[model samples]
Target: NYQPTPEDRFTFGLWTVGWQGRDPFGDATRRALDPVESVRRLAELGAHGVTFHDDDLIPFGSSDSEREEHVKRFRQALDDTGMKVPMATTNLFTHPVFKDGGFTANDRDVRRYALRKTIRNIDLAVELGAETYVAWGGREGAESGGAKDVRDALDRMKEAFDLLGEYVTSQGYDIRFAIEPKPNEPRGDILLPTVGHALAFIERLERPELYGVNPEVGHEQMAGLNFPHGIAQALWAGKLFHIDLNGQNGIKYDQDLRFGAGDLRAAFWLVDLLESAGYSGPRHFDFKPPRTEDFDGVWASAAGCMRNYLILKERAAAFRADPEVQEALRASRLDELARPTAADGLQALLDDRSAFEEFDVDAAAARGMAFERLDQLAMDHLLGARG
Candidate 1:
């Protein structure tokens, strides 16, 4: 496979290197890398850009001077290393005020506080030249039954996003907002649990045009949904603002495994779909460093995820150009819809009753297409079953 180029465009989550690999039961296996050093390391590891939460670079409740100092240092590191910031976010789930929920919390004070902090984070993202603000509302749901009605939680989420969108416009910032959907983790059931659910909510939003989706592969798989198809829907709607690449097994929890590590066949199809759609955003990753790994292992994982994606990307390209695959797709008459008809460009095509008379329903059913053959053919190419 070809190595990634400087212009290949990959953005990594800053949390992976900054994390010390700590979990509930185990102690930290690796020391946390300072955010500035992480910027330098990302450049050395060959990433085009890096993403982080506001608190990831500047600690929560930090003094104004302290926050500015940290950002200045990080900015200088990026300048020195020739790195860029393509995306930024906020830590809404880690703080105590967000224990109930960040935007959808029961306490009005907490809800407003979270909104203020997130808005400040958006400002930080703009200063860093970020094109998108990724919002993964991990805590915006109820953990216990009989706590709060689901409808109330969703309505509150809608209100928070509307406020956020208006705040962006009032400031004249160019960055777009992206909602990352997941099934559940910190919460028993999240308000917008999947990509489809999030899109429906966006349609209900006051400013649907101001928002889009940042569909993480693992997040959708955690809910037992096809990750590539979810991204396809987002792309179709022209709402794919950003992305998070990772891996997860069939529906259990948020594993955040390295990119292309789980359901690799699906990953190949994802790359193909992205290529087909001519998507021009950074290939961002939100995967985690495994708990057992130390600093060396952690950085190795950071390098590996991108390498895997690049490899799969090359594979998908080759598969797309294969003659057998093209032949099968041609046979399926998938392009049948693309061909011209007798009523081509007719303004009153729908009004003409003659258009229906020529169509034979029963004969068409008898000549039923074997769709399963198409699936097998696509899978064969995706799996590299034959050269």
Candidate 2:
């Protein structure tokens, strides 16, 4: 058996249950549920931590006193449950006031409001001991793209973040910021539409110590990009600060299905990439099952994520253990795997024939591999293999 590493223990954000309105799925039913109780139940279900967005628990344009009380209740609940708040951030773009945009809004006053909101939220995050601050620009672009200056909007967003970074540093916090990207929904053309775009934006900022990305699988698919590939690219850049694990079938809508429900192969590849990148953070799910069902759908959805994480953990270890994989990686040669690429391509050289020969590459067997015991080779390598 492969002993689980610290990195293997996956965490999830509790906010997933509240993504849509009350009733658990739609606007009317959303009011029937208790947010705090939902979080506690998630802890009982085996989540490592909870994630929060400003609008989820507090009023968008709430008074300071109201915000404080909400934070207090949230913190107390976490304390009662013994779960951590590993990630959180402001929702500056959700409200009507942010119609033009929030951080990236063309208006200076709107931009300042967004910044102020983030500052307060960061303070709250510090009080709660959250490790990460996530920023998803939900209202940072024009739907038709006729009036707003795209460049200026992007610059404003970056400036807000830069100021936030400086403030965090002065306050002596170890918190990191992660920018989440999406193509369209709330905004027709969000500023940073993919992980790669986020990477580029981060690069321009040149703050290696402060910001990274919170790439979501569903968001990537929504942007018409391959989810796992986007993750790999982010990992390669060492910019994968956090992640949102949810399902999308590379189809039309952002379904946020349970893990393995939409595209099992994509999920497997995503898990594999995550392990290879040494991601030790929470595997947050931003999912929303159909509202018509009772809590059963949400519960099953959350459980599915945990199950997938465990299975993926096991399979990744096995994949690393294959002698052919080791040789392929060591030798940097192609032709072992059936990837369509130039013989001289870098990945072609890194293909592991042993892995291909020893394991079933089919989807079902791949799922099985995820739960199988780690081979001896994996144990040896994990114990002490340099390079």
Candidate 3:
């Protein structure tokens, strides 16, 4: 029997389905008969793991006792289905109490409450043997300009993570924290609005062993950044702790479309980056089909993701096999074969002062050539492309 590579046998997290009770696809009565059964169904459909918010299994505001009971049921379900919970997060933004923010709220008491919730949820994740705990700062920024103590807010967020890291470390659990980023949603602006911002924030914490990023495709696109490039950056830093795979049209609101539906090229590039980086984690779907469609929408969305993953895998192999691509990448030294550069017209059209202010796109593009080449060599070696 041939042993398969980890990347060839990669797992996927089932996140497209929302809470059990809630009609995520707008079919009220047709709720999942049994959440565990749903997990079994997902396993049958070829998913390797499941990811859910704390509120998915237990309603928010449930007492500790109630939550324990819920966990008990969930645990039993997992046992029955042999599914693993690789990660989870809190619904801080969905609840009204966290309108201002969760981790970055100015209110000390609210901040503490959020921390407590995070600790509790992390403990739950540990109990479920989750490999990672994700925190998406949905309400952790300002809408319009105002008198804000930005530094203080950042300090509080860092403090909370440090505490959690220390505590989890003491427990001897290898659980890592993955911070998810979004540009805007419940809040007009969210802290760590892009992959670069999240990576920088993680560096500020100076806890490389403790935290990393969970880059979302839709969120990255919303920030007008290339999804694959962001992944490459995070992977270069060895900080790609998790990922949220979805499709988003660059123009309108966050669509969470089925993978490859909105931006197929971007999807191909993202898979290439993942493969080049040797990422062997869940390729999760965090999508929501239109509300008007029934539960069939959820099924279709999940099926679509499976198809996309297969296509991505095939395309990644083809990209690796292409001689022209190999030559370009071999010459470029891109961090992970996915060359990050200015989009078409970005350098030529934008005003000089604003365009090249932070970093010269032209210079970066020039440097990227060597990086891409280096990446091609690495990838070709890994994929047995070298003669």
Candidate 4:
């Protein structure tokens, strides 16, 4: 209903469904699922596409034989199940080797290895028809002092993206690179920790046009930020290449809660912006099911995310179309706030004291707002809540 159907718009991170519930404190609640089984299940749920870290779908290895075989089988699974791969990326920050950092590591070999891995994955992404390549700086920071020098780290990070961009161009691939910014996790003080930071960092890149952003909801909210506001800024900057929709409570560990499970108010605006205002990128979820649940619960949770998103998306459309909302907006003159006045009176219009004197600032500030009625109207449609 959001865009014809879920099969046309939605995707899930393969890692989200395959999560084994293993954390630092406990054993996995569910058995490890085969990668093919995930494809089958996701297809059954009517997802259009699925994303992956190279290692998540294909095992890490020195031998190309096993890796190629795995890839062939995985490609077959995609063909057999009728799904797409809209995005693919490497896990440069997950392993023990990345204890320092991935692409921005102090060690030259580690940095080279990270770039090499990403270039190799670029080929796989090309083969899979992935439209975008996401780069998440997961282990690119530290908790202790004097661990990572800021200048060296940023320099290397830029070098890696430049190399990747050149490689994509030489190979004639049309894919865009997305920087997925996270505040902190598995490390501290991650560089480009927010969408704003990442957008500014793009200015330092050799191929800024090829690079954009993939903002995750939980990553921003983990620092107690307004997630939708960050997304709005990304969209405003024209760098929203991809997205990772999850939920989290205020300023805590990344919970990766289901969409709308953490902040319904923010989630509504997100849906409104992306859906009603027309963002055609994949509605991809980078969230995992709760650790207490098993595989069945994971599947249910995954389905629920898409379901909730579509429902919100539909409600957002209605909210935007409602006559009362339009009337309220007209009265508020929110559009005129951004509108340019006629060019003839340019300096004179701005310097006019009469207009300012005629306007009632107090009346405008205290004017009756339909805000309460608007959200309530949307909420009632969101669920069986009282309006």
Which candidate has the top score in TM-score?
A: 4
Q: Write candidate 1's Cα lDDT for 186-231 as tens digits.
A: 7888878899998888999998998999999998998888988899
Off by over 4 Å in 3: 1-15, 19-34, 323-387
User: Can you write out model 3's per-residue Cα lDDT over 1-387, one digit (the tens) per residue?
Assistant: 222222333244434554232343444533544556667666666667778777777878798899788888878878876677888877787777788898888787888888887777777788887887889988899977783477887888888888888888888887999999899876777777888887888877746678899988999888788888788888888888889888898955778877777877788778877876678877777886555556766666666676776766665777677676657755655435454454555656475565557667776665534554655554554354752
Per-model TM against the reference:
0.91, 0.79, 0.79, 0.93
Q: Where is model 3 poorest over a 10-residue stretch in terms of lDDT?
A: 1-10
Q: Residue 96, candidate 4: how far off, in angstroms?
A: 0.8
Better of 1 and 2 by lDDT: 1
lDDT of each: 0.84, 0.73, 0.74, 0.84
Question: Residue 106's C-alpha lDDT in candidate 1?
Answer: 88
Q: For model 3, what is the error of residue 307's alpha carbon versus the real structure, in angstroms, after optimal superposition?
A: 1.0
Task: Output the lDDT of residue 29, model 1.
Answer: 78
Off by over 4 Å in 2: 1-9, 20-27, 30-32, 61-63, 322-387
Query: Between candidates 1 and 4, which one is better according to TM-score?
Result: 4
lDDT of 2 by residue, 162-278 (tens): 898889989999899999998886677788888888888887774656889998878888867788888878777888888888788784656777665677667766777777767
Candidate 2: worst-modelled 10 consecutive residues by lDDT: 366-375
